[PDB]
Structure formats: structure tokens, C-alpha cells
Write a protein that binds this ligand. Structure first.
Ligand code: SAH
Ligand code: SAH
Ligand code: QAP
Ligand code: QAP
Lengths: 256, 256
């Protein structure tokens, strides 16, 4: 049994009270207050549509993924990754795809900097999308479940889906459950073929074991995974530590 | 040894009487009577030239392949796939290629809806046809044999041939024998490069293990192939169910 599996079982036994305290203990998070109010008033400039803009930025600012050229954003939801990439120098085009409808976030239209190179398309199930040519492949799909075996299956499905989109391009792909042995096996194969590394984003909540397979890095997958498991297990054992609050992204205005 | 190989052996040892029962047990089939008679009288409107029009329809109405723009139809034979696509809104041109001559079906001239955008060309061996730039690649080639090794080699040949035609386009390609290990290996490589999924058409007879590699899907090829093998093996025992008969396609009349 994996360290991650022990973590999951412990997480599943928490009360909703214990869970709510745990989920943000010692994490980093952006202050969304300003953005949430502006969006409520239908402002279309400056604000990130979600916590996702800031999350992707953390990777980009550390050169783990360097968005360039034609960017595909699989599971774009409201569009946080898409809008953020649209303001980056090397990026020429952003195409976002998301399922929408009951239970799923719909793309939010914005006029943040570089909006004119973005197209977000709802009603698109990525498992039925043919792969297109692109220079950056982003994917943020993976729905949490109390069952790790369910999560294991969802994770493998994503990994099998993304592979045809990968051809010596930049990438950043969510791995919802990286600790189950079968996933590890797949990731090892994928790293051998396409390189990259798994990385834990500090803006991730303790309530999820998600890690991101980014293109620009090397290292041991198993080691990285166990380190996160250790971290998350330890964060059970301490009274809540309030999250480190950071300024949310300003995504600006106007065409490029 | 694969589940498919076991099915083949069981199939080869059936009597012609047992075969004739088995081949249609529980399948779906269109009623070709009306169409067969009209075509005998030389009528050129409404009728599909083969069972193929209905067969392709099944995929298209489920978004598995979305014919659009320039459509190439490799192994068009009488022209069932070509004439069907010719009436679809997004399709602009249909070019069908088939071998013809002794033993092989010749294109049948028709005036079904959109006939004027179809060009069906006999005396064309697809294996010597330079790859052309198309938006939809269809291919329905693959001759049965009692020997799965023979079928294996025929299948690989087709898969090698189709590959250079595929470039982020829509496609639907027959895989005559998808259960032999070497074919599975090739399909796995192709799916990694080009994506798509293998699918079983219910209008297929139990007498063939053919599956179609369609562009708009993802998933595990081995798993899907074994599911068909299981379905076909079970249909040996489960006592005969007469085929579910449906109405054949009405392909209309006139230019577009
Ligand atoms: N099969 C599928 N195809 C397409 N989108 C899917 C999907 N399954 C889940 N999704 C979507 O994937 C999204 C992941 S959350 C999106 C966060 C985004 N990066 C941002 O910046 O805001 C959800 O909106 C969910 O609806
Ligand atoms: N190497 C080859 N080059 C061209 N056509 C070929 C071929 N091998 C087989 N064929 C043709 O492919 C056809 C397969 S039948 C599939 C045709 C489908 N029912 C339709 O109507 O569109 C046969 O008629 C056969 O003559
Ligand atoms: O069971 C689930 C799973 C869905 C899920 C989770 C995390 C994700 O990143 C994601 O893409 C999908 O729902 C989350 C539970 C929930 C819902 C509303 C309010 C509070 C809590
Ligand atoms: O709420 C969740 C947890 C995951 C998650 C992922 C990403 C997020 O950004 C987030 O806020 C949450 O998903 C539901 C699964 C679950 C619930 C309770 C216990 C165990 C498993």
C-alpha cells in the first residue's frame, strides 16, 4: 500500500469540520476578494476568471512550462489558464475546450490583455476530440472522488488522451492521482518518451494529491510523489496553519 | 493466444449451416429489398448502392467521424460511403478510389442527393496512390480469410498505407483483424501519433471481427478489442436471435 493511499483513507475519515480546516492548512492561496467582486459586476478587465490563472502562473514564472505559439487548453472551464497565456509574449493563439453544461463550469468571456487571440469552446468532451497541432498542450482535467481507484481510472484516461497531443511541445498536465501504482507505471513510460517531471503546486489544497506533469524538468517521479504524500500526511498531525495569502494576478486589458 | 484467435478457430469449425445462423445472430441489419429491386430496374435516386451507406451512417450519427470538406474514400467499391457523405452539409467534395476489374466491385453511377460533388474512379490501387490533402479520410478495405495470419498481414498493409493520409483530419478506417498481437502493437503506435479509438459497428456480422479506427474518440484499444471478442464468443452459445431489421437509408435526389 502506497503512502498516498494511507493519506486518502485518513482524508476520507475526516469530519467536514476537520476537512475544512485541513484543506488549507499551510497551503498558499491568492486573495480573490477584489476579483470576485469585480466579476460579480460583470467587469471584463484585469480580473482572473478563477484561481487557475494564478496557479498556472506559478509554473510559468519558474520556467517549468513556457507557453508559446498555438496553445491548447484542455478542460479550460471558465478560462483561467487560457486568459493568462493570452498575455504571454511568445503565445500566438489560445484554443480552450471544456465540457460545460450541468455540473461543469462554462467559459467566461473577458477582455483581459490578449483576449483577441483566445477562443474558448464549451460543449466539448475532450475524450471525443481528435488531436490537433499545437506548440503548448495544457490540461487541467481530473475530478476528485473518495475512491482512489476511481481517481486512478480518471487519471489514466487523461494520460492516454493527452499523449497524441504531445509531440516535442511544451506541456502542463494535471495528474489527479499520481500515487496509485498503475498511474506511476504510465507516468514512467510517458517521461521516458516525452521527458518532463511531476511538480506539486503550492496553491494546491491538501484535499487533493494532484501533481502536474510539466515539460521542462527532470527527476524521479516516485520520489516526488512520496514527498507530497509525506507532506500531506504530516499536515493532518498539526493544528491548522493559516494559508499564506498572496496577491492575485492582474491580467490587464486590451488587444495584442 | 488472444481471445480473438479462439473466436476465429471456433468460427472456422462451424458448418455452413451453423455459420449462416451464427453470422446474423443478434446483429442489426437494414432491409435492402426495396433498394435491391429499384437498382435492378436501373433507378438512380433514393437507393443506397450497398449496405455501406447505412453502415457509415451509424458512425456519423454518433459523431465518431464527421465528414467535412474534401472527403477521400479509399476502397469505395460501388460507392456506398461516397454517396452517403455527398449529402452531408459540411462535405464539399468526395473522391472515391477502388480497384475494380476481375473479382472487384465497380463504382455504380447514381443521382442521389449531392451526386454532382462525387467522383468515383476505378482501376485505382490505393497502395500506389500518392497521399492527397483531405479533411476526411475514409477507408473500408480488408478481405477476410480463414487464416488470421493472412488477415493480420492484410490489416498491417492497410494500416501502413493509410498512415500518410492522416494529418489532423477526420477519419474512419476498417481494421479487418484487430485482435492479432502485431496489429494491436501497430494500432497502439498509430493511436499515440494520431489519436482516435477502435469501435464495433452493430451492423457488422458476427462472421467478422472488423472494427473501425475512428478519429473522434480515446480509450484502450486492447480493452475494446477483447470486449468484441467476448461479445462474439458469447454469441456462439446464446441461442439465435434473428437480426433487428431497420429501414435502409433514403439518400434523396438532385444536385447540391
Ligand atoms: N471530459 C471533459 N472534457 C472537457 N472538459 C472537461 C472534461 N471533464 C472535465 N472537464 C472540465 O475540466 C475543468 C477543470 S477546472 C478548470 C480550471 C482552469 N484551468 C481555469 O483556469 O479556470 C472543469 O471546468 C470541468 O468541467
Ligand atoms: N488495393 C485496393 N485498392 C483499391 N480498392 C481496393 C483495394 N483492395 C480492395 N479494394 C476494394 O475495396 C472494396 C471494399 S468494400 C467497401 C466499400 C464500401 N461498402 C463502400 O460502399 O464505400 C472492394 O470493392 C474492393 O474492390
Ligand atoms: O465530488 C466532487 C468532485 C469534483 C471535483 C473536485 C475537484 C476538482 O478540481 C474538480 O475539477 C472536480 O465535488 C467537489 C465537492 C464540492 C462541490 C461543491 C462545493 C464544495 C465541495
Ligand atoms: O472536494 C474534493 C477534493 C479535491 C479537490 C481538488 C482540487 C481542488 O481545488 C479542491 O478544492 C479540492 O473533491 C471531492 C472528493 C473528496 C472529497 C472529500 C474527501 C475525499 C475526496
Amino acid at each position: 500500500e502506497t503512502l498516498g493511499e494511507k493519506w486518502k483513507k485518513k482524508l476520507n475519515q475526516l469530519s467536514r469540520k476537520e476537512f475544512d480546516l485541513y484543506k488549507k492548512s499551510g497551503i498558499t492561496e491568492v486573495d480573490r476578494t477584489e476579483a470576485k467582486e469585480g466579476l460579480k459586476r460583470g467587469e471584463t478587465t484585469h480580473h482572473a476568471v478563477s484561481r487557475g490563472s494564478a496557479k498556472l502562473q506559478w509554473f510559468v514564472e519558474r520556467n517549468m512550462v513556457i507557453p508559446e505559439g498555438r496553445v491548447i487548453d484542455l478542460g479550460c472551464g471558465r478560462g483561467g489558464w487560457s486568459y493568462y497565456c493570452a498575455g504571454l509574449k511568445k503565445v500566438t493563439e489560445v484554443r480552450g475546450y471544456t465540457k460545460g453544461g450541468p455540473g461543469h463550469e462554462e467559459p467566461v468571456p473577458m477582455s483581459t490583455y490578449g483576449w483577441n487571440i483566445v477562443k474558448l469552446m464549451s460543449g466539448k468532451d475532450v475524450f471525443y476530440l481528435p488531436p490537433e497541432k499545437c506548440d503548448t498542450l495544457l490540461c487541467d482535467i481530473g475530478e476528485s472522488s473518495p475512491s482512489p481507484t476511481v481517481e486512478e481510472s480518471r487519471t489514466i484516461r487523461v494520460l492516454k488522451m493527452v499523449e497524441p497531443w504531445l509531440k516535442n511541445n511544451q506541456f502542463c498536465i494535471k495528474v489527479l492521482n499520481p500515487y496509485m501504482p498503475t498511474v506511476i507505471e504510465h507516468l514512467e513510460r510517458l517521461q521516458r518518451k516525452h521527458g518532463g517531471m511531476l511538480v506539486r503546486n503550492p496553491l494546491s489544497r491538501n484535499s487533493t494529491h494532484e501533481m502536474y506533469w510539466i515539460s521542462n524538468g527532470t527527476g524521479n517521479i516516485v520520489s516526488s510523489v512520496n514527498m507530497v504524500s509525506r507532506l500531506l500526511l504530516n499536515r493532518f498531525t498539526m493544528t491548522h496553519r493559516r494559508p499564506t495569502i498572496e496577491k492575485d494576478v492582474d491580467l490587464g486589458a486590451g488587444t495584442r
